[model samples]
Target: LHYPVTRQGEQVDHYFGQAVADPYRWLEDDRSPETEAWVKAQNAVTQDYLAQIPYRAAIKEKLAASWNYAKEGAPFREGRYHYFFKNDGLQNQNVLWRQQEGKPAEVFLDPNTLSPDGTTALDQLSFSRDGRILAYSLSLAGSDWREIHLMDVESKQPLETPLKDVKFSGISWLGNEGFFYSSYDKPTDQHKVYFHRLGTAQEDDRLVFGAIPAQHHRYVGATVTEDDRFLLISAANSTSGNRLYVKDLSQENAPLLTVQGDLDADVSLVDNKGSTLYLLTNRDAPNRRLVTVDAANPGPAHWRDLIPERQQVLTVHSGSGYLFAEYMVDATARVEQFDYEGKRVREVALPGLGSVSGFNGKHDDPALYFGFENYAQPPTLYRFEPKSGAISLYRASAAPFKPEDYVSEQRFYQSKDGTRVPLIISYRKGLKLDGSNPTILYGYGGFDVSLTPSFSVSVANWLDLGGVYAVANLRGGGEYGQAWHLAGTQQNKQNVFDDFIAAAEYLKAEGYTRTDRLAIRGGSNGGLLVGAVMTQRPDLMRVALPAVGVLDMLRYHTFTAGTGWAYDYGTSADSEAMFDYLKGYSPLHNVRPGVSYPSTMVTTADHDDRVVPAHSFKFAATLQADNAGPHPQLIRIETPVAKLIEQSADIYAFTLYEMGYRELPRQP
Candidate 1:
């Protein structure tokens, strides 16, 4: 297969007196017609290549069959009805439905109707104190850019024109008077919080915070307490930590009070009662814990320990007058229940050892709901009685998959530095350990994101095709806690790569698969992991699938809100030492001429404003030009939702094809 010839420019950047060439710098300009032409041309070649795979159609059909099922989200209460999202079989988007005590559920907000193509996905949703109004944000073409709109919950009609230019925002309500939302200018230099009052023009929104004399906040979000008594603003220069401030909304013209003025740790206002506030912070605890403080003097000094730190990571959620403390023990979810007084209620008896989501509901709601899933099991919603500690199955996915036929287990493996990392592997049962199985090792070891076991149609489909799927809890992830995260960041970022490389070696050493049958896959930061590992050790795997990855580490901080990720990836402009470190592992910079690489498929999107398409664009162009191997190096770009299945099929089909499969592998 022939690859498109990418036009290069003689662009260079000087970092700390060192000149680095950026040959494909022209691709960075997403607005240019040249970049548009390159994208279309690259897609044409990639799609044409994928179309030639004999089993590509069969793989897509199998993926669709695995994806075709009635799916429902955990129910949430708003005003007089319980609301939840539902998708029938193969719809592009999920539709919101509302139900009452004696009436059947009806569509409240059908995203399919909002966008003709159903590509405009719902990003976030929030309801007013009494649930009379709902504020929702939508992102079109899979871009991080958002538009927020209000809806009258009872009437199910638009409240006003959509507020545009919002990104990475959360809608917080102050009773029914108005709500708070955050936005950055189109160029996104800074993020600011604003108050959007009812029936007001977007231009008339009040600037609540984010403008300061000495500092520029890259990410700012506002959240009102459950009681609606205090409005909390969290301002962050980076993604890891934020400076928190609180204002008493019950009082007239209340002054904003400082809660935590340092960005050393992450602090969040979880709940509040009157003047007393419950905060979840990692200020002194890397694993995180809950602390109580009086709003009048809510400084870090005044914080009283509510729940102490545990060895595992703590995530707290409040609902039905109880606090749910979800802990990640060895990358598996285990939740505990506690009363508002900080008294232990019970250890939530989850159905299995998988990940659980939800338990977020109003204080007086009758029942609490959560969803649980693992590698083998499809996601099943469970209803929990807060008072009785009784958990019953609420809803289970109808995907044509069975848990009894597969095995999902956790195993601890040693990394390069002798750190113990957990890996969850799932595949069909009665399988041989003969080092002949086709395996995909997946990881994302940055930004404190945990790789918990959650069922996915793609993973299920892969397993159904007799393929083994494994996820490694790498160092930079929050799986073990902040200490774990810190170990995989900045100069320590190599630990993440070392950890992933070790995982692949473990798979091979343990006879799970050989080099020719193994594939490395990840997205975003994980994409960086795949790129680094495949480049550093090209002989380790046969195929590499890096999706929308941050490949350009040296210049990553220059793009939209990318500066905010500096906590994990220190920019090349930081110092001479930092510049050398960034360029050392940067996927785009590390490509050497005549080096043989893995059969690589670099994936990114045209509308991906977050990482931007330039990362993949530059990486693909470099890989195609530099690699001396016979393997293919291509890129696929713009898409998600059912498009997720499309990409998964393409990646899977490509992987199988590269692994020497001329036909679909027969399922056991």
Candidate 2:
């Protein structure tokens, strides 16, 4: 297959007196018609090759069948009605429903009609204090941009025009008066927290905090207390940590107060009762604990330890007049409850080892709800009464799939540095340890994002098709805490790559699969992981799938909030040392002309302003021009939700095709 000729420009950047050439710099300007032409020319060949797959349509059909399950969210109370999200079998999008105390649930709003292709995804379904109003955000085309909208629960109609230019936002309402939301100017630069009032124009929104050019605050968020008495703002230049500020909103012209003025550690407001405020922070502990103080005097000197730090990473959520502390022990979940005064209430019993999410309800709510999922399980919704330490199944997913035939287990493997990394492996049972099975090892070892046991139909589909799946809890994730994430940052970033490389080697040594039959997959930073490993150790796997990866690390900070990522990836401007470190493993710069790279398929989307499609575009071009092998180098782009079925099918088919294992099943 012939690849499109990507145009190159003589763009050079000088970092610390060193000149670095960026040949395909023209690809970065995604707005140009010439780039569009190149993309069309590229997709022409991709569609032609993927269209030839005999079982690609079959795979799509099976994926659709498996995805055709009735999904129901745990019921949440809003105003005088109980609300939840529901997606009937084969719905284009999930429909929002509301139920009366003694009545059946009825359709409140259907997002399917909002988009022709059902790419409109909902986020931040935050309700007012009394549940009288609902403020939510939705995005179309998998974009970082979103529209924050308001809803009058009384009449179930929109209050005003949808607000625009919002991304990476959470609709934190301070009673029904108004709410706080975050937004960038137009998908980049700085994130500012703004306040929106009812029946007001979006332009009239007040800038509460952030977006100040004086100091760089790339990411900012605002959270209000339940009483609407305090507005808390947290700002950070990167994903690692944020500086906390609070304001006594109840007082007229209240002055903004500093809770924590440093961006060195992660901190956030937990809950407040009258003047007393609780905070969850990792300022003094890697494994976080809760602390309390009077908002009037929230200095570190006046802080009191409410909940002491433990060995395990603590994730705190408060609701139903109690505080729930979920601990990540070896990447599995175990939750404990406590009263506001920090008295241990009880250890909440769960069905099995997996991840538990929820308990983010109102403080006075009678019962609490949470969702649990494991590697070999689906999300089972459970409701727990705060008065009684009892939890019962509320609503479980009625997906037409089961995981009884699969085995899910955790094991500790030693990385290249002898650091013990945890891995969760799942695959069909009754497997032979002959190193012949087709396997996909997935990992994301950055941004403090934990690779906890969670359920997705895509993983289930992979396992159902007799493929082994492994997730490594590598360094840089919150499976531990700030220490873990920082350990994998900058110079220590090598540890993440070493840890992932070691994971593949361990899988091979354990007879799960060998180089020719193994595939490595990751997204975003994880995508960067795949690209780095394949270049550093090209023989580690056969098929490489990197989705929306940060390939050009040297120039990554030059685009779309990429500067905020300088915490994990030191900027080229930092020094010659940092520039060398970034350029060494940068996926785009490391491609060699004579290397026999894996069959690579880079995935990104046109509207992906977060990481941008140029990363994949330039990487694919470099790979196609440089590779000296029979293996194919392709890129998939503009994958909306509708195209997800076919894209998923193509990735799976391509992986198997590269592995030379073709028992193409027509049905699940």
Candidate 3:
């Protein structure tokens, strides 16, 4: 049964705290070797659990059954469709192609053929407009450095001119004979644009743009105009923000069109003719505004404001002399198209959609292609015709199962700080919202990343087993935009934990579920969330699953790719205030002895070079030894050889482990 909390009485617990005393003191200590050994044991247990699951074989079979890569992104291409997708899970990644007419699909190249060990992953693919040649990248596992490979379409042959140790960015077709791509030289980190001639030797590569510094600490690649005459690039300082620069690539060492700005500015769109440029800048207000600049007279004052800064605009797309803009209106997105005169020419209304993900278009077609999905729906691709005010569904990636068989509702709760938070509750249809139902609450509240709506078959399986799934859109996410993200990050990290607790309480209050029937799960930053909550409110959960989590925040900055996230979690060495915040909620540092945590299952992958598995290993060790509660603590170390493999097996096994500990009867 589910019981939602009352609106008014929610704040009572915030001021009058019924704090549970923690008896597990040894769990918080870092100097203990016994604690370290315990963590190792948990890792072993998790590894064994993973070995027992047939996840790899299951993924292989499922992928083969659902194999329809040849048909995807076909109609979107103007001349021919060139595409790549993971096949047989992540083990076999391949590239294939088909023409606009009734041409059969053909395999261009496979990464497994390039690298036998599968250590190399396919990064990007680019085909010429004529569809004759292809350029692709192969990179080492968990690293950015890549080797570029060129393939011939007609011959179905690949050239051995491998450009090693070079990081390739955007790839563009200059002509059927020549192409342009970006490559950054290491140590200096300067990104330079280069031109390469097809059917030529490796020495034929020439430097196109050298004046512009390749270092793009903020922006990634140069946005080339469709006409191939103009290029847009952006650079940013550490704290001040970014500045956009436009260059005329046709000229020798193309000159910069706009000077670097003191305020943040980004190049939004470049017209098909390369004659007009649209810029989004915060030079006037914190909210972004759109301004237009001519390619001929590219000056700061010469720019004219098209969409002024009265309202906030999130996304902009341009095609066929029309500029399309999407604005956030009270949590819902509104899309509109305008002409050069800045007059609203058309308003777009989506069909059978809750939210829109992205939109794209080709040169010939006036109809815009849109991609959209919601919590209950898989991705649906549509062709929007403005003239007829009609949207036709061209493609959809939907599960065979019926979603109406499940029930879902949105609930709200007040946090420990009296801040209201939103939660999504999903369960089998007709299941009572009473407190007796078993439920899993999931959350992530950091990095301003929104947990976008997506359909999962495994989640559906859980619902079929009479289990409830809840997602807490806690603080530190972009659900409510930047302000909401700021409220849950940095010094305000504890708000994430508090927000999750409030969600659990809301479920308990609504009679949806209680402590014994409740479970908490999260990964990465969300993993940190579950870790903190389990330590803080152990009695409120029946199971706790934190996978590939940043358990040891104090030392997280020292690991590979960890330094990149210092902005989200401030470095412990630099700021005393951040240190205090880190120490306050760092899962490994906060676990105490004799405390009764729920039956905890800590999971991490050995191949996860992003977040070290040591964190999960250490945290589980401390929890097992320190907890004096009747509930058991277990650790599951999942080591998927590659990223594309089924990580869901660990998740399923962990759920089953919790089920076993709870002694819940298995469903037929």
Candidate 4:
């Protein structure tokens, strides 16, 4: 439908300002039994679709493969190692480790089978050097807040001294008897570090560090030196830029490591090998550079750059006398190893490695354990042997389908403002690159979180159906780095929309697909993206799916859990500029009367505590009433008692059914 904005004096007011009627108003009328029947029918239709798919079998296979995925360098002591991971298929949680000599990985505990008192989701697990004790954080129903629990490794028995009602962020073992952990009060979002003795009573716990008042700040870096003389802590501001502080546990209260006035710095103090401390901070540029401190003078002048910041350098890690740095230039990760003198010892080129999630090694005989994956590949574990300059694959998560089954490529398109944006395209290999193919485009352009390469089995079905799936790496994402994120947020939020449109147009130009057969989908922040695109270019798609989306931007900040989103989407009350920006694109506000538009399916979960379902419900109601088009408009309110990930089969079934229905023959 053509929906154009006009000034106050324009004649377009009648079409745009007309009061929209509600198509699903009967649902709100509790007196109607017809409404109840309609809901039942919708649910039945969804369930029938789910039963037809081999969901159970598919999930079982996916989970089994995921469980066997190799995890290297999993901290080991004595004979046993420690690690935690999730099974993607069953959507179950498990904590397990292995014996170093020669033993199959053993499952310490499975959350699916755990009793009510135990945690269903384990976030972190750590073992004491002596292998006598194990510390872990467990959450009820997989929530963010977790209760810390200590277990005797030998007995597999939980300690009686439970740290109840605690919301721990991370845990680090200080010794076999004592450990340091950090927790934050959710309401105030202030963090407090505490030292707990394994077998002692709760009264014996020591308050290691007082609360830090910053609301969104987190203790990103915390470690204990091997000597156990000092506990190194690093605290950051709201944006996650941090400062390193060293606490001498030998004294009652230790002094800070660096002077307080540093700006935009991020520091990490490694486990002590003597008194040397490795720091990586943005002292010179927004991207980080490597620096070394004597564990004495950590001032700006005393910060020696072990590795200088190139425009491409993204991260640096230090251990003993060796440093590892990964530079990202044009979306590729190039890893380099440097000695204490800033001399390059070894270099490794890894192309298309989305991001280095973790890296571990030692000094005398260094070996790197790294994880790498791309959009077309599942996560693969690799062992980097610097001595032999060889990279061997430790594990490759079995993919149900091969990468060759689909033709995938990365393309860049210029936005309305001349900014170049990246887009990843994947489709069935034999599918013609003609404009007639059905295409589904997705995007999430907020939170400074980069959309890395990751594979989804359900997405394979779409490709198998001769559909094209494209992911737009627009601005406001860390894909191109932090600067890219800032360019698409706040007043520049429109840049994200422009970038999305450019990617769609590029797909059309490359003959991958055309607007008539295009469908757009996104959830949450990406949901906001879909809403903006559909309202701005309704002619560009045959179908629109905005699941758990934020359509009423003006009131989103007022809803539950929406306060945290204020950082990304500016609150309408405080920022008038944001109000204007949101008002201009808000899907609810932009709906026009007597306009023909594409068939739309708005999906929402009744149990979604994150993004309230009312937003989607209200938007769908408005669309059904206002549009003059013959295209079908429906709302699928999925009321699942299970978790989101657990309902993947149902979700995928609904998607397939919706697409199939739209392609059905029309009655005369």
Candidate 5:
């Protein structure tokens, strides 16, 4: 297989008097003409290789057929109308829809109409107090940078000039008059929260918080109370914890007071009943709890427990004048409710053992809607009667899938440190333990992100093709709680890689699949997981898929918003010991000459500024130069749903072809 000749650079950096050569450093310049030329040439090779696979088109057709089903989100009432998002099978993006009493639903916003290629996506949406105005943000080419637009709900027309250059923001409405949003200026590294009035220009937006040199923070977000009487400001130096602040919006020129001035915990204002504020925090509780404090003295000293922490990890939402506390019991859902007076209402019965979302609406809403999903089933919408603790199915998924046809079971495997980790394996029923099945092991063990059982059509395609899919809930996630997450951060990051490797080993030991038929895949930090594990134990699996990963740990912090991830991955510049620890497992630095690695396909997008495409570009170059195997090393770079399905098909096709499948396998 012929690969692009990526030009090497003589760039070398001395870290703590240790010299590290970066021969492929030129790949980092994403804006250069040379990089552009390399991208086109590399893509040509990748496309040619994929085109040669005989069953590639068959896989894509199967995926598209599986995905061709109408899907709708649970509707929520905002003022006089109920709004929801729906997609008419295979549409590039979900269209926002709205309906009123005694009226049929109509398109409120169609994102596919915003861009011809469907590369534009709606990031978020917020409505004013009366729901007369809507503030929505859109992103282009998958970049984090967004532009916010306003619309008159009744007229369905533009209200004002769009807010440009916004990134990592939340639009919180103070009222119909104004709202608050966060923005960061790349040139100045200045991140700030600004308030925009109804009739004001973007230049007139007043700075409400952030941009203080002494109070430096990488990320800042603000949320207005449901009643629009107070504004909650949470500032974080990293992804794990934040310092919170609150201001009395009901009063004129009220001073902003610090509620929690230290970043030692994760805290946020949930809601308020007049002057009594409901605070959700993990201050002294690793599992998290809710507390109440008066506006006159809103601090830790004056707080009273509303709902204490439980053994299971808790996430709370509000609706119908009650707090719904959903607990994660070994990655399964169990929800309970409580009144504002600290009295336990009742346990909300879930439809099944899967992930439950929703229960968020106005405090006076009569009922709420939630969705349930697991590995074998698509999301099914359900309506919850909060007052009576009743649940009824609202709409069942239209996807052509049968839950009874597949088996999804959870089991525990011991990691390298003897730590028990949970793994969920899903495959078609009657699958024999013959160690001949094609398996894809997926994981993301960082940033407090949990690997809960959820349904995806792409995964469904694999299962429909008689393949096995497994998810390993490793540490550095919020599955168990904060302690579980902390156990895999910084110098302990290797625990994540170990847990994944253990999961793969468990599969082989159980006769689910052998080494030659296994594929390891992950994205973002999970992408880092795939890269690290494949380099450390190349013979463990046959194929590796690392998408939009942070491969070069030594200089990751220098990129956009990468500094905020330092809590999980400590910077290489922290200390001599820190540098050594990072370099020890850094994927880019660990590539050895003449070593035969797994058939690798590094993936990223041109507009993937979050992790950036440079990471994939450089890693692919290193693998192509060093690996002595006959397997292909490829990269797929700003490459959109019809587009997403194509990529999934490409990945699955490549995995099977490299595993020596000349013809697509048929389901037994």
Candidate 6:
């Protein structure tokens, strides 16, 4: 073999009666110099091959052209100015801008200046009422761990003292005094909420909640009510649900009140009107509904339903003194307005069949903003006035690409278990169903995540290149609500893979594409989907791209806060049955020496504390050592924003070359 040899280690872990051999286990220690050296060696080979592709530059150029567009963000009013985000064509990051009435837009915050490569990104931002102070968070290289900075809204200069160890938190300002946030010292799971006063050191921050080390809470954050009369502390062991604790800030010696102290369901404090708190919960209905509880006696018995659950999945937003209930009907957004008493105001007509998001504002605000987009169209923002029932287009993208030439349609297919699933297929309008066009199928069937219609540059490029792009709404997602998510979790997790496989099979059976021209892609949890499906059925795709995937399901929970994902992916230490179940589909464990795999590109970053780079490192090593295929098996280390042009061009060029497209396609 001419490939770079990976030294195998003699490490093995006993899971119940199963002794799983971990040959490349040393790769798990990403901090070692040996691991860093190995990454260079692998990149050397990958770069060499990618550079050899004739006209690989052409693919990159096309990506740049398609990606270059004037992207607009929703506008919100704070203080005396209206603020929004905008990214100039081909810029590294979106620049925040503020526009005063009758005045031109001016730069408010430019993240592109933060890094040479534009890798530093704005994660979150919060403003004090009356817009006195600004506290914002930034993420480097798309890492989950963040650092927060405070800025005076008037001067627009950041405060000297930066708050550190800020992770999985939100900056909730309590008047103009101080803001409450969450942070962790080492492992991110055990976090503490604290209050940081202006112009003070982070060490001077006072603990508000979640500092106890003996507790089992893996997630905790504080949120101040809109009225600023009460503080809510949400404690969660997992992403699926949390326990709500509240404190009456009006009192001097106010004790924490247990609003809901159970993990059985999620309870979030939506908005408060004086002593009554509006809650959005799924305790009785999986689709969720809104209710109100008195602050004095906020118990189940004393609670009254404000808005009842419906057949469709309900997503409520409170602003303008109205409950904006956005329901998901088979992955499409349907928003309706209701008064606080649950009386329907009006069904807001959406732009079209796709995802509609936003309407983020305060309850007393006169107007709110929203965004509507589909796979074929770029984002279109609109401002809606509740009183007049008027929706005026605020901002629309001037996309250079021809959106009219593409067509997106939804279709239903039956999974392996005869369960019906939805799939969105998009392609150039003149695409032929000859089972010969190159196709890319994407899926992420975990974490109760919903895959809605949204346009992207890479995907648009694929469509314009006469290729088909399909998205499968698998059960593990929130497409059909809670029951759907549960159906694809734990022992039933394999159902997600099965659903993805059936969609690929359907695409072929429907004469869209065949096995040789089909490629699969996903990131994070979706990356796990692609890895599992390819190993399960290698004949399903010609190329597999699993980016920052949780590959080593057995050891995934051992990393920084990975245990918090146990709600979706049952841990190996849970039970003997759980260990066996995880080992069965674990991508790294499933690799066999004699079997050939599809051309695979495993992507991860050095700074990915969320899933850890160790997962991709170990998987790539295992594939390189065991795979019998002559097809390319590569690992990409730049997970976030770096080398995107190279990654896409390499993958497209490699796929076309491997698929017998010897000559590069000529530019039209």
- Highest lDDT among the candidates is held by which one? 5
585-643: candidate 2 lDDT, tens digit per residue: 88888899888999989888865778977788889889998999889999887735457
**Cα lDDT of model 3 by residue, 227-270, tens digit:** 66776655543446555567777898766765344435444444
Per-residue CA lDDT of candidate 6, range 234-262, in tens? 89888788888888898997888788878
* Prediction 3 global C-alpha lDDT: 0.64
Name the runs in model 5 displaced over 4 angstroms. 2-41, 66-69, 75-277, 281-287, 293-300, 310-313, 362-366, 553-565, 571-580, 605-618
Query: In candidate 1, where is summed lDDT lowest over 10 consecutive residues?
Result: 182-191
Model 5, 1-668: lDDT tens per residue?
A: 88987878889999999999999887887878888889999999999999989988989887877777898998878779999899987787899999998999899899998998889999889999998899999999989899999999999899998999998999999888889999986215557898999998988888878867855678899999988898999899788888888899888899888888898899888899989999999899887889999977888888788998887867899988999889888788888889888889898888776798898878878888888999987899988998788889899899988877888888899999999999999998889899999999999998988888899889888988889999999999988877889899999999999999999999999999999989999999988999999999999999999998999998899898687898899989999899999999999989998899989999888656688787899999999989998887899884557899889989999999999998866632
Q: Candidate 2: which stretches are off by over 4 Å?
A: 1-37, 76-83, 89-103, 107-288, 293-302, 310-313, 319-321, 360-366, 385-388, 554-561, 571-576, 606-614, 665-667
TM-scores, each model vs. reference: 0.74, 0.74, 0.74, 0.75, 0.75, 0.74
lDDT of 1 at 35: 86
**Candidate 5 vs candidate 6, lDDT winner:** 5
Model 4 residue 503 lDDT? 83
Query: Judged by lDDT against the true structure, how good is candidate 2?
Result: 0.84
Q: What local lDDT score does residue 216 receive in model 3, on the 0 to 100 scale?
A: 38
Query: Each candidate: RMSD to true structure?
Result: 6.5, 6.7, 8.2, 7.0, 6.2, 6.4
Tens-digit per-residue lDDT, 94-208, candidate 1? 8889899799989888888778877888889888887888899999988998999888887778888888988989998888888888888621467889998887788888888
Better of 1 and 5 by TM-score: 5
Give the Å error, residue 486, model 5: 3.7
Report lDDT (CA) for all predictions.
Answer: 0.88, 0.84, 0.64, 0.64, 0.89, 0.83
Tens digits of per-residue lDDT, candidate 4, 29-67, equal 323455445455554544444455543435434433433
